[PDB]
Design a protein around this ligand. Structure first.
Ligand SMILES: COc1cc2c(Nc3ccc(NC(=O)c4ccccc4)cc3)ncnc2cc1OCC(=O)O
Ligand SMILES: COc1cc2c(Nc3ccc(NC(=O)c4ccccc4)cc3)ncnc2cc1OCC(=O)O
Ligand SMILES: COc1cc2c(Nc3ccc(NC(=O)c4ccccc4)cc3)ncnc2cc1OCC(=O)O
Ligand SMILES: [Mg+2]
Ligand SMILES: [Mg+2]
Lengths: 450, 450, 450
């Protein structure tokens, strides 16, 4: 039957010592709560009820495009009170899964298993085994069905040795939630309405509560501070790296690899140590990425080698291209097949045609460069003062001599040759050779001050 | 009552295979012995007696400004002999704590606890529990008071299972040290005067020896070689990173973070992987540091972003500035608020005014640049041959065209405009436009050799 | 007596998801099979029989210069069948050691111990203790001599608790191999001729099989996929780093150090985090390597400092030189003693004489530079269009002004001085001062568009 989700995301996260609310801190480049929202969507959730409160304006701005129901909680009275804020929107005939915005690593696979196990009119409770369960609510089974969650302070000597504990994640139908949430009381040391009390209330109605164990404890771990957040980050990155390794990506050291988005890859892709992949990246067959590279939102064709300490963003690189080391591709850089970009070169919002080379100490911005061009060392595209970033157009088979300035707007036609040290302000015609006439003074017998 | 410290630092450190003496090898950028000296000072030590020997001249040069008593030991006859070298300087009425220059991670907190526990006319002995205590002197308690330290070769089957062992760190009063040190003998397999024998001598005088356990074993671990030193380094860096994380600094991977000095920070500071912080660094609120950056002795204002692979030293950066990627700030670089420094740019001993930009392939040295200037790509400040690094002075609202050389000493006044490819040797006046008149030869129908 | 080796290397390595065969994937920059071949050679193997099959053409091209006997297996019928392919080449009177091309970390020391233990006309079997031996063939000893290898599915409750298991590595004489290999059958669930059956056949002949335990399990671990390969890589790099640390090399973080070849070092060498050493590298005394450096096939003299993010290949650096940060040395770079190479500088196939400095934003290619030269910022060596990379020759004590282009072929004699912004096309004589005569237009009262 249908499914909807409730995500608790109202927490201040005081121990983060941040102006952000708790769930907006990122794992792998995206907010903890976004991980959970995405997981909820992957499960096929019809509605996603987001319980929010602290940092409300920041939540709204940071998650503006998320397809969620914004349930603004005015006061924090416990998890049961939080869930009950969304209860009026529950369908009687749908399943509801309760999730936590500060526990981001819960997987679709584990939640599918939880939902599957839910008995009619009953509850499916996600549990986990801990080597040291001290502090956590112990799962008491009579059958394989949960009759109680006994808290640390109430447990007898025998119960304290129970390793299986409550995670707080649970599934039940909407009608049952609406029914039981209205019966939850707050007579306890904290004065809070606990969602945990639904296990008791379910048993009061002779409805069975089934336990389902999480595969990894890190799926249910929350982040209360940045040390814990860093632990989740490393676990997540290791898991991502392991998946890629088993898919056939050669990651030289998975402990020194970071994926912050999505990676599409071909076969025989090699990634050296300390590479960061951000946004949506596509790598073709036999792509080799050297140490220290940063790729953000890029498409890299087959057989490309990116040499060390290259930074690429919002760019496209054709097959058999060679980039780096120390290359910078800024947004809008489009390199054709078999191109060459070398050290201390910056390309911004420019197209570079097949076979062309830009190998040293050069800035190319707002330009179109044709096929088989030779852009010499020290070449710079620039503008007049007060300009609006006008374009430099370079044709096919053009030689641009070293340390030449190309002053936009300007066009250099096919087959043109430009001598070293030239300032190009007027258009250059097809097969036109332009060389600078220098005036020099030569003084003989100049003894250096040494 | 008063406190003084004795630090054993005479060792050759043969297994380091170094020309340095043992205690001068660094942890987090400073000598092992300096860590211990600093800890001794933090405790409120009145005197610090440094027992030294091997590499004496190097010790003297490397630790010249340390407020210690230089006790030169001419021969190594054991720990008791070493401590007795400083004994004539002990006050009868002060406490003396014995520390080791090759065991650098001992904390102030642990030592305060040790001193607190010292009974009058007795000894406080720092101990530690080891899972495998094989090789170490076993602590024999009768009460919670130490009656013997039984060495591995002397221990019976029962005593070998004792996990608590001697660390060698101890506190006693000066009069008691002077008394007992004179009674220590050398009748043992090594022929050495052992400080350990004070436990026996104390009990001979019916003076109680109290045991105090160290929190972490790494506090009492020594470094005999560079493998062990590296282990201490990693433990120390992890501990530093954890502290910063709990304080609210977002360190993306604490295993790839290095602090070699002191870090002052605001809130919501983000530090990406493989960053090194050296000397005294201050970061404001919401500072973001990209991957691969090196910051040494820098002050960074609020809301600054440092992009990847930037190296900064002895520099100041104003609020909302943008630095990198691939930026180099050398000593004396002072960037005002809202400045921009880009890839392949080097700034040395220069001031750059509010809003100014230096974004590509540029060297600015020994210069003053005003507010809202545009320093084009390829611009270089230089000197005449035989000069003494003279200054380039650039006013407010100046445009410097790409690939221009500024030849110091030279002044460019407010509002001036300099065309691309210019060589500036004479002063430029207010609102003066200077453009280079180029001579070019144009040859039509030049067929390239392709 | 004499020794020869058989290496099994025929596997497809399907779970690598690669166009390469299994054993060509690299550990520390070289094919897994090459590690084993080298180890076989270090042991003093007279012949090395390489059993190959899948990716045969790639094996042949990648391992063309290896001194091995190429035994092409046409079908995979089990390990015994594989070894029997080389059996006709076994000497009756030599020992034969069987090794696996996908288990690269087996050490010479372990194999020497295995060979030593081999009883006459018997077998030496390499075994290993596993905490969880589930799945592996259990070693059954009667004496300290192996009477059976009992597989998981056949073992009784008692035998399953045996921790010692078969690795598959074994030594026996050539005559015995030829004898027993002909008796191996394939009556089992897999229908394969197993080398394991030699233990049974040896006991049938009343020949003793002796067990020898491997020191580390990682010596006998195979890599079936890239996740397992990465685990072997990290173990190997840690082991290499540990060796260097114990030899006296200061590696700041051995978890962030990579050696992919061989390193020769002096004393007091310091290597910061994220350094990669490739090919054959030699470092002198007191060499300091900053973070992020890549050194491939380089010789570095005494007292050289390489600052962060420098990339060096096929280059030589004289004593007391200073390189970096952000320096690029390409093949053929030869720097003399006391030279200086700075940020955003690229040197290719050039010699640079004693005391000379090239400190900013410069390309020097195909050049000879003499002693005590000053190569200014922005200097570029270049060629005419259609040239064949001709040479620039610069003498001793030459000053080259900033942003000057040197157009090869050209010679600049001793003591010459070149002004900033010059284009040098004609040879410059001894003590000749060359300065560019600029034409400038100065327009007063030019109000900028701001
Ligand atoms: C941050 O948003 C909230 C998270 C909560 C939250 N998060 C959470 C829940 C469970 C875990 N996981 C475990 O308890 C657990 C961890 C390891 C093993 C077993 C269990 C972690 C975080 N728990 C309880 N209340 C929460 C309330 C939150 O805001 C809503 C509000 O303030 O009304
Ligand atoms: C390097 O300076 C010295 C250190 C010593 C030294 N250092 C030391 C002492 C204790 C530890 N720690 C432990 O024994 C220990 C470690 C782990 C668990 C328990 C104990 C480590 C280094 N120990 C003994 N004698 C030492 C002598 C030294 O030079 C003075 C001289 O040569 O006279
Ligand atoms: C890749 O080349 C082969 C490796 C084999 C191979 N490699 C191997 C052998 C042993 C181990 N190690 C273990 O079994 C082991 C690991 C850990 C503990 C104990 C044992 C790993 C790889 N094993 C068996 N057959 C193999 C066959 C191969 O190609 C030859 C052919 O296909 O005919
Ligand atoms: Mg230039
Ligand atoms: Mg120029």
């Amino acid at each position: 039957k249908a499914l909807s989700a409730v995500i608790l995301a109202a927490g201040k996260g005081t121990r983060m010592y941040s102006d952000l609310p708790k769930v907006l801190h990122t794992i792998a480049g995206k907010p903890m709560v976004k991980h959970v929202i995405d997981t909820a969507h992957q499960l096929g959730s019809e509605n996603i009820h987001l319980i929010y409160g602290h940092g409300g304006d920041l939540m709204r701005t940071h998650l503006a495009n998320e397809q969620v129901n914004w349930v603004l909680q005015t006061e924090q009275l416990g998890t049961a009170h939080a869930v009950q804020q969304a209860a009026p929107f529950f369908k009687d005939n749908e399943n509801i899964v309760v999730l936590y915005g500060d526990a981001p690593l819960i997987t679709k696979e584990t939640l599918e298993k939880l939902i599957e196990a839910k008995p009619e009119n009953g509850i499916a409770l996600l549990t986990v085994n801990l080597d040291n369960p001290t502090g956590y609510g112990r799962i008491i089974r009579e059958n394989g069905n949960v009759v109680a969650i006994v808290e640390q302070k109430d447990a007898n000597a025998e119960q304290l040795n129970i390793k299986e504990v409550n995670t707080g994640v649970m599934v039940s139908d909407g009608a049952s939630f609406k029914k039981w949430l209205a019966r939850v009381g707050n007579n306890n040391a904290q004065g809070e309405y606990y969602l945990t009390d639904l296990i008791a209330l379910a048993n009061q109605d002779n409805c069975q509560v089934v336990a389902v164990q999480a595969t990894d404890v890190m799926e249910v771990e929350g982040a209360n501070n940045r040390l814990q957040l860093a632990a989740l980050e490393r676990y997540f990155q290791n898991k991502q790296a392991s998946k890629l390794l088993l898919e056939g990506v050669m990651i030289y050291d998975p402990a020194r690899f970071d994926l912050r988005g999505t990676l599409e890859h071909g076969k025989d892709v090699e990634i050296d140590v300390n590479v960061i992949i951000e946004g949506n990246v596509k790598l073709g067959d036999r792509v080799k990425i050297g140490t220290g590279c940063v790729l953000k939102n890029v498409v890299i064709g087959n057989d490309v080698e990116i040499k060390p300490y290259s930074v690429l963003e919002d760019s496209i690189v054709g097959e058999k291209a060679a980039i780096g080391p120390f290359s910078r591709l800024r947004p809008g850089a489009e390199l054709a097949a078999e191109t060459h970009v070398g050290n201390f070169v910056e390309i911004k919002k420019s197209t570079v045609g097949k076979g062309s080379k830009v190998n040293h100490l050069t800035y190319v911005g707002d330009s179109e460069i044709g096929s088989n061009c030779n852009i010499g060392a020290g070449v710079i595209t620039c503008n007049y003062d007060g300009a609006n970033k006008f374009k430099t157009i370079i044709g096919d088979d053009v030689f641009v001599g070293s340390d030449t300035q190309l002053v936009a707007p300007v066009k250099v036609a096919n087959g043109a040759t430009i001598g070293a040290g030239t300032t190009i302000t007027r258009d250059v015609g097809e097969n036109e050779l332009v060389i600078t006439r220098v005036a020099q003074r030569h003084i003989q017998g100049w003894q250096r001050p040494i």
